């Protein structure tokens, strides 16, 4: 239906340093526009970029003509006949997404889809509206609709058939991301699906595999990710198709940090132009850095800063600053020494960490039990 993110994120929403404000991407968006003529991408285009040019209404004329003709056709087919369930009405709303979603908006289409959902019985229509409006709320920054539709599908709709919702975790790539959800869950369903994709509507297979690798290597640093993302068959095959992603993954796995950072810079930049850009490109490149640092610091007791810089890319002072910032944040258990130029790891053994966790969890439980006891018996 509407695959290429409508080029709108890369379009003039990536100005300044990314600078993406006019290029062949605008051409691609405009050809996707003129075919099935649309004015909805022209809202902001009626405001800031190509505000009041000749084409702005020179397309609007036959666009309005075509949409009026097709809406008239749908209204005639809806009033003349009385088709029930999955019917010409659902055709009217699916067009209305191919239309007013790409004429003016989702609101009319959301209403029409709600109506036909009240009228229909089968489930793929509900998944259709889920992904329709997930992408629409990626155009207009909507998440409550996505989670409402996801709950409707998973909790209630998924009692007949199955095998569909999994990829609609794409929202979970960007829901709780900068703490827990750019990974963990977003990887455990990408992995569970990479064998059986069957959802080419949202994204091609290669892009899906890149997303899966990206989220899995932040979900799993070396907790035997290899059992699922390196020994994985389909992932390996598509990586044979994608040299850059394969190098970026195996560099981290094979402790080739010098090239892992160059791969991570490339990932950051190519990630800064996506539906995934605005949410967490900064966060992802911080987390992967911390992950690689912890991987190197593990299996070491005291590392010379020079050895780090020569083996971790560059920047003795750069590495000093980064380690300082990351230890200050509480992650990356290690203590950095100055001009002696040593970095000492202070990872507590199992017993000491166990005692600390006992203290923490028991303090939580004790505060809870104290509160409970005091509100009872006055």
């Amino acid at each position: 239906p509407k695959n290429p993110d409508l080029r709108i994120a890369q379009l003039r929403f990536l100005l300044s340093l990314p600078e993406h404000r006019g290029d062949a991407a605008v051409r691609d968006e405009l050809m996707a526009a003129v075919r099935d003529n649309n004015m909805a991408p022209y809202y902001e285009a009626l405001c800031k970029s190509l505000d009041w040019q000749i084409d702005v209404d020179l397309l609007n004329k036959m666009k309005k003509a075509n949409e009026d003709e097709l809406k008239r056709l749908d209204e005639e087919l809806e009033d003349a006949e009385k088709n029930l369930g999955e019917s010409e009405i659902r055709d009217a709303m699916m067009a209305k997404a191919e239309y007013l979603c790409r004429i003016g908006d989702k609101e009319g289409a959301l209403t029409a889809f709600r109506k036909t959902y009240d009228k229909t019985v089968a489930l793929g229509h509900r998944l259709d509206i889920v992904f329709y409006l997930l992408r629409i709320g990626l155009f207009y920054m909507d998440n409550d609709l996505i989670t409402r539709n996801t709950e409707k599908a998973k909790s209630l709709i998924e009692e007949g058939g199955d095998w569909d919702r999994r990829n609609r975790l794409k929202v979970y790539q960007g829901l709780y991301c900068v703490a827990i959800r750019d990974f963990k869950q977003a990887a455990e369903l990408f992995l569970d699906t990479v064998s059986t994709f069957t959802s080419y509507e949202l994204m091609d297979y290669k892009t899906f595999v890149t997303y899966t690798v990206y989220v899995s290597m932040i979900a799993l640093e070396r907790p035997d990710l290899r059992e699922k993302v390196i020994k994985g068959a389909e992932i390996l095959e598509v990586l044979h198709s994608l040299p850059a992603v394969r190098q970026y993954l195996f560099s981290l796995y094979e402790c080739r940090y010098s090239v892992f950072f160059q791969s991570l810079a490339v990932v950051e930049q190519e990630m800064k132009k996506d539906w995934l850009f605005a949410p967490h490109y900064r966060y992802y490149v911080r987390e992967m850095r911390i992950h690689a640092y912890s991987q190197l610091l593990e299996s070491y007791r005291s590392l010379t800063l020079g050895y780090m810089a020569e083996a971790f890319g560059v920047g003795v002072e750069f590495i000093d600053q980064e380690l300082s910032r990351f230890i200050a944040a509480g992650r990356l258990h290690c203590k950095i020494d100055k001009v002696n130029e040593i970095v000492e790891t202070n990872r507590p053994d199992s017993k000491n960490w166990q005692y600390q966790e006992t203290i923490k969890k028991g303090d939580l439980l004790l505060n809870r039990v104290q509160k409970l006891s005091r509100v009872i018996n006055m």
């Binding site: 068959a233 389909e234 390996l236 095959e237 044979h240």
Partner: protein, 52 residues
């Protein structure tokens, strides 16, 4: 098509490529299908040797 010797050739080639892509389980599945479809056909000594 009733032709199977060429079918076995194609299945073996598919398994070879699948192995070359590190897609080992799917390569094994294609090889098993080739073996099944060859245990019912002439399978000349070259094809048998190649399959083994």
């Amino acid at each position: 098509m009733d032709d199977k010797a060429l079918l076995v050739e194609v299945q073996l080639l598919e398994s070879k490529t699948y192995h070359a892509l590190s897609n080992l389980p799917k390569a094994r599945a294609a090889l098993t299908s080739a073996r099944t479809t060859a245990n019912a056909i002439y399978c000349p000594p070259k094809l048998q040797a190649t399959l083994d």
